[PDB]
Design a protein around this ligand. Structure first.
Ligand SMILES: N#Cc1ccc(COC[C@H]2O[C@@H](n3c(NCc4ccc(Cl)c(Cl)c4)nc4c(N)ncnc43)[C@H](O)[C@@H]2O)cc1
Length: 377
């Protein structure tokens, strides 16, 4: 009988896995990537999902939808919805106090619900799983952040149903992360787990209790607008001033010059997780000038120091809400691609007095991993 899949439906990035033959397989897409962007684009002739939609973003900003997870199951008048709208190139209209994203598709003006947009991202993850398994997939477990209310969970389940799946259950992402490491398999007694999630655009800290495989959410804290993208912003803003100091020219009012500097900065930051120095080499960046420069891991840590240090406040709030002491936490799990930053790891380990972090499972894949495991139960 057909296998059930585990879907990690992320704000910026999505991942799908399957549990088969006592093993977990994180499924790669038609481009060989195990992570797909949570993007949907509407063109003159077609609808694009994932990387195909992400790669054409600058040539179609208004009809490339992303961040649907920020709107899913919320009301238009919601303050969250109202402040986020100011930063999106796509139009968000009001229908009965329900948000709808409005775009131009095949000559026509069309409006879709956030659950309709996420259903498109879920249709892609499903199809990725079917090409691998060689048969049509029906059953799925889709994850949600632990702080999500019942409207947001119903709306997420609705996306699965619209995508053609039978949503067996909706579980929490920190729950899926603990299941991946087998912390639910320790038996009778109380274990306290802290999951530290630092992704592309979101930051969540959760405290769970596991007693005989039964999970209890005790505290949730964080910042829905803190992630990897902010670290790129500090690097970008650092190299704009450096180009000024050297060439006496402002690159910020050229869209392509800023887009190209961003790409370079993302990769650099990435090199610095395993290296003490990274180099930036952009040909004809602005005014015909080649920008051949370098940054150290130390100068990078300096530019982001306030951001890395602020990740300890929601750790303190979560402990104080859960009414626990740091010595009371039995396990520490690292989830999210930004947790690869050595300074992020040093800060969390030092706070927890040199204790060991659970990080061997790819931080981008750990949530889908556990969700596939849970889907097989
Ligand atoms: N291909 C691919 C791909 C795979 C996973 C992701 C998810 O990324 C989410 C966040 O995770 C960040 N991140 C990632 N993401 C994993 C990744 C792996 C490969 C590629 Cl090409 C890319 Cl770019 C990203 N690696 C980091 C690192 N080594 N040091 C610091 N931050 C890292 C990334 O910059 C982003 O902010 C994004 C792209």
């Amino acid at each position: 009988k057909a296998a059930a899949i585990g879907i990690d439906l992320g704000t910026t990035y999505s991942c799908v896995g399957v549990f088969q033959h006592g093993k977990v397989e994180i499924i790669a897409n038609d481009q060989g990537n195990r992570t797909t962007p949570s993007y949907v684009a509407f063109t003159d002739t077609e609808r694009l999902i994932g990387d195909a939609a992400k790669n054409q973003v600058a040539l179609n900003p208004q009809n490339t939808v992303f961040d649907a997870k920020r709107l899913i199951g919320r009301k238009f008048g919601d303050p969250v919805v109202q402040s986020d709208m100011k930063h999106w190139p796509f139009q968000v209209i009001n229908d009965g106090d329900k948000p709808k994203v409005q775009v131009s598709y095949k000559g026509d003006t069309k409006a879709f619900y956030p659950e309709e947009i996420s259903s498109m991202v879920l249709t892609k993850m499903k199809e990725i799983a079917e090409a691998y398994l060689g048969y049509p997939v029906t059953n799925a477990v889709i994850t949600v952040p632990a702080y999500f209310n019942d409207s947001q969970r119903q709306a997420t389940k609705d996306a699965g149903v619209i995508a053609g799946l039978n949503v067996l259950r909706i579980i929490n992402e920190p729950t899926a992360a603990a299941i991946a490491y087998g912390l639910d398999r320790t038996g009778k007694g109380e274990r306290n787990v802290l999951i530290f999630d630092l992704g592309g655009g979101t930051f969540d800290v959760s405290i769970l209790t596991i007693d005989d495989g039964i999970f209890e959410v005790k505290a949730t804290a964080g910042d829905t607008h803190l992630g990897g993208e902010d670290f790129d912003n500090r690097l970008v803003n650092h190299f704009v001033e450096e180009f000024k100091r050297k060439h006496k020219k402002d690159i910020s009012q050229n869209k392509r010059a800023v887009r190209r500097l961003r790409t370079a900065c993302e990769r650099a930051k990435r090199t610095l997780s395993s290296s003490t120095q990274a180099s930036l080499e952009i040909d004809s960046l602005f005014e015909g000038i080649d920008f051949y420069t370098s940054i150290t891991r130390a100068r990078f840590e300096e530019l982001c120091s306030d951001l890395f240090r602020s990740t300890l406040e929601p750790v303190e709030k979560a402990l104080r809400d859960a009414k626990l002491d740091k010595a009371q936490i039995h396990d520490l799990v690292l989830v999210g691609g930004s947790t690869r930053i050595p300074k992020v790891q040093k800060l969390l380990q030092d706070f927890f007095n040199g204790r060991d972090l659970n990080k061997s499972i790819n931080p981008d894949e750990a949530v889908a991993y556990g969700a596939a495991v849970q889907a097989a139960i």
